[PDB]
Design a binder for this molecule. Structure first.
Ligand SMILES: [Au+]
Ligand SMILES: [Au+]
Ligand SMILES: [Au+]
Ligand SMILES: [Au+]
Ligand SMILES: [Au+]
Ligand SMILES: [Au+]
Ligand SMILES: [Au+]
Ligand SMILES: [Au+]
Ligand SMILES: [Au+]
Ligand SMILES: [Au+]
Ligand SMILES: [Au+]
Ligand SMILES: [Au+]
Ligand SMILES: [Au+]
Ligand SMILES: [Au+]
Ligand SMILES: [Au+]
Ligand SMILES: [Au+]
Ligand SMILES: [Au+]
Ligand SMILES: [Au+]
Ligand SMILES: [Au+]
Ligand SMILES: [Au+]
Ligand SMILES: [Au+]
Ligand SMILES: [Au+]
Ligand SMILES: [Au+]
Ligand SMILES: [Au+]
Ligand SMILES: [Au+]
Ligand SMILES: [Au+]
Ligand SMILES: [Au+]
Ligand SMILES: [Au+]
Ligand SMILES: [Cl-]
Ligand SMILES: [Cl-]
Ligand SMILES: [Cl-]
Ligand SMILES: [Cl-]
Ligand SMILES: [Cl-]
Ligand SMILES: [Cl-]
Ligand SMILES: [Cl-]
Ligand SMILES: [Cl-]
Lengths: 171, 171, 171, 171
């Protein structure tokens, strides 16, 4: 029971529980990514730390959603967390591509949740997504695309490697 | 006269004046609540201070609205402030229930103002309500509902009182 | 492939992956427990914070195991995380009993892993469990049993409540 | 003569003297490795410093064993230190492979000493190996395997070199 619920549709409440599941799944994905790069036969600890920090941010996003669910008087319902889609993640390039795919899917889920909140005339929900999720996700995707470009440049060629060093080491 | 007014409908201007009245009324309600709990025959100074702080927050909300009215080039119009609905407020439980009723009514007025601003295509108004009012009101209502649950638990029973002390004193 | 693996049996490697799954499951359980106590109709924030901290400790335990798996040259394999066994957790007493059941099961898994490491003559594994898991788990279970006794005393009776206050407030 | 010896078998006492010899031999190996990389025609001072620090750690391990031998009432007996197996150590890759071979052999000697202490029911010995040697050796081997992977990646190819720079310079 709740004595506080106001203007909070069952549709949104359900969608928020699904979004918590997606965020926790993504956190689990990034946990797997990070420990893959910590393998002795891979050994790119910087890549390990990049994904470890993303695992933490996606868990924090889920916790924010759960806190909001309780603030509106909705009820958290948890489902199974499906294991990540791969057990080994290939090259740095492969892993950064998988990460962008994952983030695009979370972004689309955020946009879908906004469409539902708009249809339900739920401005608190909209505000919440704007305050904590929409711009954070755009920033992250921009950083990943920048990373993808630089991995491609570096693994591709000696001119590529040259331009990278000029920017990174001289500038 | 105004030389600055742009995209600011007479409907919104009127609705904002009504919302100032509601906020000032709520401030007056909380003033009455607080001094009731300061009576020698009631003497719950912590409850007095809780309502005294709410009186201050509701006055501040009204002042924010008035400042916004002037920033958009609308004209503040004041009406009578109706005295609060009771002269004595009963138990702590009774008073917390009345407070949640009051906050729900302010929240609904905020949602109604958003619906009007949306119909008038007034995004500055929407932004304003998001920046200062929607999440503040949800947070406050959540706190009041938490309080209601704890008052009910405490006044209800020895098991209730027991669980409360474990949480509050041990944890 | 690994160039470092030495004295690390496939049986232990598999058992460690299963133990990571159990720890992550327990973390997920505690996440559900904590947000249950944050509901407006439950509203025991101290209990919420107790379980929130346990969720963090169980995730940290899983991460320690994963780091150890990589240090020995074993390969992390993740499975589905089954959702927690309940959606609502009843009283504080009910929830503390469920927590002790959960911790007893992790403790038994640690003891089973020691039995396997002993049979495989793997002293590094034994050392690892001693350094990070066995005494931590005994300490936690002792704290939970202490909590269970105090909840029982407090919810049970006016003599019980009296003895608790003497200890907590006077001493 | 000793007035303190208790539960300290002649077998363990002998094995500990042999382990001191192995540790001092390894220290001597690393001394040779380090000065090889300081040659003007090799000139990788970072590699020199890596091996110089390992020479120091292996000497410290021997000194710890000798101190323990005296604490149990056993008698240190020293043998010849055989010169290192090579006079020149080839590439960085060659030298890191030789180092991992050396560390694997010390690790196996530690495991063999644990097997003997277990057969002799000598828990102080076991504790000692756990406190100062088993996890230190696993950590070191993990670091060396990580190094081997990164040397292989770097000396192998332009894609390899690219991935390394992304991790090391960008992340
Ligand atoms: Au990682
Ligand atoms: Au890392
Ligand atoms: Au929206
Ligand atoms: Au909306
Ligand atoms: Au650079
Ligand atoms: Au540079
Ligand atoms: Au550089
Ligand atoms: Au007052
Ligand atoms: Au007061
Ligand atoms: Au609006
Ligand atoms: Au609007
Ligand atoms: Au208390
Ligand atoms: Au207390
Ligand atoms: Au207290
Ligand atoms: Au919580
Ligand atoms: Au909490
Ligand atoms: Au063991
Ligand atoms: Au063992
Ligand atoms: Au107390
Ligand atoms: Au007290
Ligand atoms: Au007290
Ligand atoms: Au050197
Ligand atoms: Au050096
Ligand atoms: Au042993
Ligand atoms: Au032993
Ligand atoms: Au670098
Ligand atoms: Au760099
Ligand atoms: Au660099
Ligand atoms: Cl990680
Ligand atoms: Cl809306
Ligand atoms: Cl007052
Ligand atoms: Cl609008
Ligand atoms: Cl929590
Ligand atoms: Cl063993
Ligand atoms: Cl040296
Ligand atoms: Cl023993």
């Amino acid at each position: 029971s709740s004595q506080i619920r106001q203007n909070y549709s069952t549709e949104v409440e359900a969608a928020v529980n699904r979004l918590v599941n997606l965020y926790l799944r993504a956190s689990y994905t990034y946990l797997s990514l990070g420990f893959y790069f910590d393998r002795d036969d891979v050994a790119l600890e910087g890549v390990c730390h990049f994904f470890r920090e993303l695992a933490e941010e996606k868990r924090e996003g889920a916790e924010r959603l759960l806190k909001m669910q309780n603030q509106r008087g909705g009820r958290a319902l948890f489902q199974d967390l499906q294991k990540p889609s791969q057990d080994e993640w290939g090259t740095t390039l492969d892993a950064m591509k998988a990460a962008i795919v994952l983030e695009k899917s979370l972004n689309q889920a955020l946009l879908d949740l906004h469409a539902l909140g708009s249809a339900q005339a739920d401005p608190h929900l909209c505000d919440f997504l704007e305050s904590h999720f929409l711009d954070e996700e755009v920033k992250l995707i921009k950083k990943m695309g920048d990373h993808l470009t630089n991995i491609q440049r570096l693994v591709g060629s000696q001119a590529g490697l040259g331009e990278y060093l000029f920017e990174h080491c001289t500038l």
